[PDB]
Amino acid sequence: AVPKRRTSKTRKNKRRTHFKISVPGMTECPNCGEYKLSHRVCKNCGSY
Amino acid sequence: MFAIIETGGKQIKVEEGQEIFVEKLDVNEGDTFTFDKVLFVGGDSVKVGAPTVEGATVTATVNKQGRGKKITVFTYKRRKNSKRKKGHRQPYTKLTIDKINA
Amino acid sequence: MEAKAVARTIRIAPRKVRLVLDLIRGKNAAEAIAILKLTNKASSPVIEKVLMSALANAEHNYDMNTDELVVKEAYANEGPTLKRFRPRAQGRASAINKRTSHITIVVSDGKE
Amino acid sequence: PRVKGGTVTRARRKKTIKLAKGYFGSKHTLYKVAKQQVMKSGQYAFRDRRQRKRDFRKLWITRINAAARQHEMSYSRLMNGLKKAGIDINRKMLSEIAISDEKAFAQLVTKAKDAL
Amino acid sequence: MKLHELKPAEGSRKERNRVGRGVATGNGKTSGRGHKGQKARSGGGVRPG
Amino acid sequence: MQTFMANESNIERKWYVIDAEGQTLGRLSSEVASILRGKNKVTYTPHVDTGDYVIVINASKIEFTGNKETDKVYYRHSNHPGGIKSITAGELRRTNPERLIENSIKGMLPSTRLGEKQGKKLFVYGGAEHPHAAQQPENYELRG
RNA sequence: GUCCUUUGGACAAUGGUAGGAGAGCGUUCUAAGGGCGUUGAAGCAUGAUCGUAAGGACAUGUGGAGCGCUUAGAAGUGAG
RNA sequence: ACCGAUAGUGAACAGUACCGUGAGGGAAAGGUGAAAAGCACCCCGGAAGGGGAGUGAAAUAGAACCUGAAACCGUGUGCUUACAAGUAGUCAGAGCCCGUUAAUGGGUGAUGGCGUGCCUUUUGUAGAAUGAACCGGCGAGUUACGAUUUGAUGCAAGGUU
């Protein structure tokens, strides 16, 4: 119910290994455009 | 080609033209020290000195009388309030071999 | 040649800004601007304004190009913290920290 | 007059923190834990300066014993034979010769052997 | 005698003992008193006689 | 003076063949463990791996003394409640005798990571036939 | 320490809690004498230096006006 | 031979903010520069903030303004790490990277040996007995008057106000 010892820098930064943001897609927009959220309805600088 | 000499309280394997470090000798820098106690001669003809080789001198030239790397001696006892701290540097003499005799 | 920009006292917790700065680091500028428009995070617009300010410095202050530019450095530093309190149940209080950050990027040329 | 507890405290604490350099995590950064590790390691070094002597003697004896079984003899019997021949050479010396010049070591083995 | 170089007679002044100032002095932690009881206490001891 | 060979680094490992027919398990085991360990080389240092490869091929003419066959149970636990298993010496020698020999070699080696590596220089075969002719293996005879 | 005392050749000795005895290291302030400092004081940071210990220097960077040493004296004189 | 901003008055800017029905209790908080010359102007921006340029001996002296330690949080990089069992050090020791108060040089470290923190209290504590989250400051044999016993110094059948 309470932590028995404190958490160290090594252990806390190991736990944060997967606490990441996913890279958004990076596909070329097909009709016209540039790299984007893949297979999107992409309108940002494009016409998907 | 190599010889065994007994100097200080220790024994050292030596060859013509190498540098050695021994316990302090009474000599000054520049001088030539000569070792008596030779135990083994590893040449083309091998001489074994079970006591001594009876002859067998090794010549060397003194250079750099010096005092060694410093170590801190520290000891303590746990729940007793006693600890001791002191420093030590050990003296040495530096030599280069020129002669191995027999 | 390098150019930079800084944003000081951005009232967002640095641990949250750093999570979006890891997507644009070491990328070239157009790539980075495009990435900062598709990720939905509260700090994306602020970071994107600092990147435009840095890009603008590199072509007015040092009068060089803008397509041959790469994000050399991006980091967040801590600012000063504001101290607050919530009231909790048994008539007793607890602390709230309102953390801030300092934002820097540097856009580089790859050369002198 | 009044003294302040000024610049002396940091100097004394900073010596210990520098002397804890290379330790793991808090061990090389925080004074109370660094002080404990730096006094613990000083007591290790005393014990281990004593232990080097016996560790190298153990290694020399085992290498001479390896060299002795090659010439069909045991370490204990060899050293006894050398004592009876009077040979004054040393465990460390006996290993260094047995590694560099096997032909000098073989003559020692024969004299140690017919001394018996 | 000059006023910048002056010394007392040999053996005429000593320094005072200062207890409670670490362990190498010999009378740190308990400061000469031992461990417990009435004579380890501040203002303690007993009346003469 | 430090005049002392230690740096075994860049050693030369060889390849050996011992046969198990009509030997005692423990005595063969201890001599082989010594060879794998490197205790027989005038150049020996405990922190680097000297020592060399040993091939045991008959592993079926192993000899026990006394009533070892029915006694000498082997045990293992699976960390699952009540999960103790067992097998007696004779039927372990009768099915998978290679395990019988290599277990008792590896129990005679240090349990460090270097020691568990030195146990990987061991190859055991039931029957007098092995595949290692490209290594050019030499016969070694138990010098008890 | 010991004693022939050539204080060196030896005869030695040298684990330690309550606790007794001795000798020292640093801090702030005062007197006297000599010093240093915008061509850069104190403080801060780094170094592979010195002393038997507490501790002392010097070089470099930062800092921008004060501060050492020698002999003596007096204490709000040392923290895990 | 008093203190120098946790000191010295509670109070260097207050019997105030605040707390209490009331009697009453009671803080934290000094420092740009010699002189405001306290940043005209352009660029990004809604702004804040920044980049140049300028003033200055000096703007990492820009008002959160003398210096600016540590805990704590980051960015980069030389060596090392995904078969491994641990008070994390010490002694030995390859391989790789360096070059100093140049000296029996520095950084990191495959692999081997040995090794149950500190303080307090106890016959006896790794203890599953106490205490400490970490770092910084502050925090405990003193003075006055008497008495006894040592050391020093002057005079001595006297010595001292």
Q: If you write DSSP's letter for every residue of F52-102 in order, what string do you get? A: -EEEEEE-SSEE--SSTTTS-EEEEE-SSTT-EEEEEHHHHHHS-HHHHHH
DSSP code of E5? B
Q: According to the entry, how was the structure determined?
A: cryo-EM
CA distance E45 to E28: 20
- The answer to whether the CB of D112 falls within 8 A of the CB of D82 is yes
What is the domain range of residue D58? 1-116
Name which of C40, C50, C49 is nearest C19 in CA terms: C40
Interface test with C, best of A36, A41, A42, A48 (most C CBs within 10 A): A36
- Got the DSSP string for F112-126? SHHHHHHGGGEEEEE
Q: Is B76 helix (H, G, I), strand (E, B) or coil?
A: strand
The reply to whether E3 has its C-beta less than 7 Å from any atom of strand G is: yes
Specified resolution (Å): 2.7
User: Residue C106: CB partners within 8 Å, gap ≥ 6?
Assistant: C2, C3, C4, C54, C71, C72, C73, C74
What is the domain range of residue A43? 2-48
Sequence-distant contacts of D72-75: CB under 8 A, at least 24 apart: D73/D109, D73/D113
CB contact under 8 A, D62 and F44: yes
User: How big is chain A by its Cα radius of gyration, in Å?
Assistant: 20
User: How big is chain C by its Cα radius of gyration, in Å?
Assistant: 17
Structure-token pair, residue F39? 């205790």
Burial class, E4, CB count within 10 angstroms (exposed 0-12 / middle 13-18 / buried 19+) = exposed
CA distance D96 to D90: 10
CA distance B24 to B89: 12
Q: Is B35 helix (H, G, I), strand (E, B) or coil?
A: strand
CA distance B98 to D11: 50
- The answer to whether the CB of A47 falls within 8 A of the CB of A32 is yes
**What distance, in Å, lies between the first and last C-alpha atoms of chain F?**
38
Chain F residues inside the 8 Å CB shell of B12: 1, 3
Structure-token pair, residue F89? 């010496």
Number of domains in chain D: 1
- In chain F, residues preceding a discontinuity (C to N beyond 2.5 A) are 1
Name which of C78, C76, C60, C74 is nearest C32 in CA terms: C74
The reply to whether E30 has its C-beta less than 7 Å from any atom of strand G is: yes
Q: Is B47 helix (H, G, I), strand (E, B) or coil?
A: strand
User: Residue F4: CB partners within 8 Å, gap ≥ 6?
Assistant: D56, D92, D95, D96
- The answer to whether the CB of D108 falls within 8 A of the CB of D82 is yes
Residue ranges covered by each domain of chain B: 1-102
Query: ∠C52-C53-C55 over CA atoms, to 5°?
Result: 60
Cβ neighbour number for residue D54 with a 10 Å cutoff: 9
Its sign, for the CA torsion D44, D47, D53, D54, is negative
CA distance F9 to F11: 6
The reply to whether D4 has its C-beta less than 7 Å from any atom of strand H is: yes
Burial class, B57, CB count within 10 angstroms (exposed 0-12 / middle 13-18 / buried 19+) = middle
For residue F36, give the amino acid letter: L
DSSP code of D29? T
- Got the DSSP string for C14-80? HHHHHHHHTTTTT-BHHHHHHHHHHS--TTHHHHHHHHHHHHHHHHHTS---SSS-EEEEEEEEE--
Q: Which helix (H) or strand (E) holds D58?
A: helix D31-70
Structure-token pair, residue C18? 């750093």
- The answer to whether the CB of E30 falls within 8 A of the CB of E20 is no
Structure-token pair, residue F115? 């020691």
- The answer to whether the CB of F120 falls within 8 A of the CB of F51 is no
Report in angstroms the alpha-carbon separations of A34 from C30, C44, F108.
Answer: 10, 20, 66
- The answer to whether the CB of C22 falls within 8 A of the CB of C109 is no
Report in angstroms the alpha-carbon separations of B1 from B42, B100, D107.
Answer: 6, 8, 16
Burial class, A42, CB count within 10 angstroms (exposed 0-12 / middle 13-18 / buried 19+) = buried
**What distance, in Å, lies between the first and last C-alpha atoms of chain C?**
5
Chain A residues inside the 8 Å CB shell of C31: 35
Distance from the Cα of residue D12 to its chain's centroid: 32
- Got the DSSP string for F76-90? EE-SSTT-EEEEEHH
**Chain H bases under 7 Å from protein CB?**
1-5, 7, 42-45, 47-52, 64, 69-76, 83-85, 88-95, 104, 107-108, 110-114, 117-122, 126, 133-142, 151-153
Chain D residues inside the 8 Å CB shell of B49: 88
For residue C20, give the amino acid letter: V
Name which of B26, B48, B40, B34 is nearest B98 in CA terms: B34
Q: Virtual CA dihedral for B58, B64, B65, B66, nearest 10 degrees? A: -130
- The answer to whether the CB of B17 falls within 8 A of the CB of B99 is no
User: Residue C30: CB partners within 8 Å, gap ≥ 6?
Assistant: C67
How many alpha carbons fall within 13 Å on the CB side of residue F97?
Answer: 19
Phi, psi of D105, deg, nearest 5: -70, -35
Distance from the Cα of B21 to chain F's closest Cα (Å) equals 6
Report in angstroms the alpha-carbon separations of A2 from A5, A12, E11, F25.
Answer: 9, 17, 65, 55
- Give the residue from chain F lying closest to D55, CA to CA: F46
Helix, strand, coil % (nearest 5) of chain D?
80, 0, 20
Phi, psi of F86, deg, nearest 5: -155, 160
Name which of C99, C96, C82, C17 is nearest C50 in CA terms: C17
State the nucleotide closest to D3 in CA–C1' terms: G28
Structure-token pair, residue B84? 């001791």
How many alpha carbons fall within 13 Å on the CB side of residue E7?
Answer: 3
Number of domains in chain A: 1
- The answer to whether the CB of D90 falls within 8 A of the CB of D79 is no
Report in angstroms the alpha-carbon separations of B18 from B15, B25, E42.
Answer: 6, 18, 71
Report in angstroms the alpha-carbon separations of D103 from B40, C84, D91, D97, F11.
Answer: 13, 86, 17, 9, 21
Q: How far is the CA of A48 from the C1' of H50 (A)?
A: 37
Structure-token pair, residue D3? 């003294």
- Give the residue from chain B lying closest to E28, CA to CA: B81
CA distance D56 to D61: 9
CA distance C79 to C99: 7
For residue F22, give the amino acid letter: G
